[PDB]
From Swiss-Prot:
Inverting glycosyltransferase that catalyzes the transfer of one glucose moiety from UDP-glucose to an asparagine residue in peptides and proteins containing the NX(S/T) motif, resulting in their modification with a beta-linked 1,N-glucose. Likely acts as a key component of a general protein glycosylation system. It holds the Pfam family HMW1C_N. InterPro entries: Glycosyltr_41/O-GlcNAc_trsf (IPR051939), HMW1_D2 (IPR040542), HMW1C_N (IPR041109). It is an enzyme of class 2 (transferase). Pathway: Protein modification; protein glycosylation. Its EC number is 2.4.1.-. It is found in: Cytoplasm. It comes from Actinobacillus pleuropneumoniae serotype 5b (strain L20). This is UDP-glucose:protein N-beta-glucosyltransferase. GO terms for biological process: protein glycosylation.
Amino acid sequence: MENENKPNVANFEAAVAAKDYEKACSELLLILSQLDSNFGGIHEIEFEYPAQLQDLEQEKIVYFCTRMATAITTLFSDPVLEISDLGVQRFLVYQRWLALIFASSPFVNADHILQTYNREPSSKSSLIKFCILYLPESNVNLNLDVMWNISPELCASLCFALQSPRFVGTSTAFNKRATILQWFPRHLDQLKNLNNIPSAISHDVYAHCSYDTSVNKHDVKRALNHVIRRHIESEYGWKDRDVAHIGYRNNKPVMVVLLEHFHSAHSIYRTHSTSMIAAREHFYLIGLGSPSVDQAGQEVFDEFHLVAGDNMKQKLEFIRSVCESNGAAIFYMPSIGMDMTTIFASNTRLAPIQAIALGHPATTHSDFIEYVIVEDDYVGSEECFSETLLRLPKDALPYVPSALAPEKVDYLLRENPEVVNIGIASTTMKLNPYFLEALKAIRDRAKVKVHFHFALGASNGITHPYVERFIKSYLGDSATAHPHSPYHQYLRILHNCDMMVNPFPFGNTNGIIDMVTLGLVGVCKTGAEVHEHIDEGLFKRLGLPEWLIANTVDEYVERAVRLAENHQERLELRRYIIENNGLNTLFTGDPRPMGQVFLEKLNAFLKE
Ligand SMILES: O=c1ccn([C@@H]2O[C@H](COP(=O)(O)OP(=O)(O)O[C@H]3O[C@H](CO)[C@@H](O)[C@H](O)[C@H]3O)[C@@H](O)[C@H]2O)c(=O)[nH]1
């Protein structure tokens, strides 16, 4: 009737008390949906609160979470409650938002509701219901092999949902995802289509694997590729392109670029636009993207078109029709994994040369992509990548500064401070028990008092209270969790610090430019994967001693403790960076190599 799709806590609660299980679920699913669209934000969800919490936002958020947790408790403990296999689908996709509802509440998890399902001190619904509430923070045990027998598609639907959370830093949650990342690949490979699994969080599953510490963390991507490939053939009737003969525009071979989060106020653009603007010396560039791409982002390309269609099928047909019409010789995605469109297109053939760049630093594991554009100074092991790494010179991707960069600076070089303030520039995905245990060691081993200021991205609304407890569980009073801040307030948090540090499994790119902008020095850890190694390359590009670059976690702790302890040695490094920072080297170079290496690889092919 009216406002029948408006998320409202009182209506959810009313339907529960009234035992109208259908309205109760549908009202729950409205709220969960809103939390999804708002990335955990509780604004746009209608509720009232005691006056005391008016200006206490964290407490107002925990209040939201507790009120929802208690109503979900009443509902899901009712054995009368039945859920459609359609409800299980949607509920599982919002399971992460269910997870944050319980994790930011005093309850931590939904295990108290899970224990009511035990009638052995019963129904498919009971199981379904068990899976809906088997949250990343559950301490309940689960055999996944037993579950795969009972229901192969339901098990996959949960493994997908335990891979969807952006922040899984808790040992309890990180372990579930690490276990799933080892177990689930061989089982996902067995499915034939995406019709009975949580499709909509496929991309999450595809990208969040890169935040694990295992060497084979990317396995799950190949299996997903296969299923996607089986899906597009079977459900879309996908037929690949004749990539035998190419075509020409303005007497140059055609590069078709599929775009992903390519707005000019973003790193992706800042990091890969120069490389594509210069590839126009040898290619006609047709850009395919969303309306999110602004004019600057479209001006990269000779031609820009919006990816049209209402489903992946029509959109994949558009990308094909363009490549087919222009006989595109190169299919290029600067970023693969943020939007499903690229991931699906990665499992098709639309041009003889198909390549990605590392806008997301992870191998595709797709047979339909041959090359990976990457800078030499950022590669560790090339064996981390199914594709052939097209390693370009360290000057080959000149960056574009953001217009947000300050023009003026004040350097706080604290002579022997009583407390050493250490900055952390991290998003929730980058947080893990290994990183946090290393940070505990630094506090514990240092002969100087230290404080850790965390500037957290994606730590908003319901997300932040849960992460705050996580950080406090390791460092307590030696750590402040700042939620997401505007750039100028984010730099002020960092400005307050004496040195900085970053998560080792997945390093920082912008965080380092931020560190150096403020004349700060810090410690990173390098590794085989590019997302480990970038930090090393970027340190060297900017002029950072390699003693500040660790290979092991134990060294990471050693060198940071040293940076904290030796006040004057820290300040000499800061004064060195302040005077000879290579921040300008980041914004200069020759971006033409990429367009050249593509032409050679194409020309060789054309000749055979
Ligand atoms: O409270 C906050 C927290 C963060 N930020 C901003 O967020 C940025 C950091 O974003 P982040 O996600 O850490 O970017 P990086 O991780 O440094 O770069 C990533 O994105 C690049 C896109 O090209 C990839 O190539 C890199 O591999 C990948 O690490 C900073 O510039 C901050 O200005 C804020 O403004 N306020």
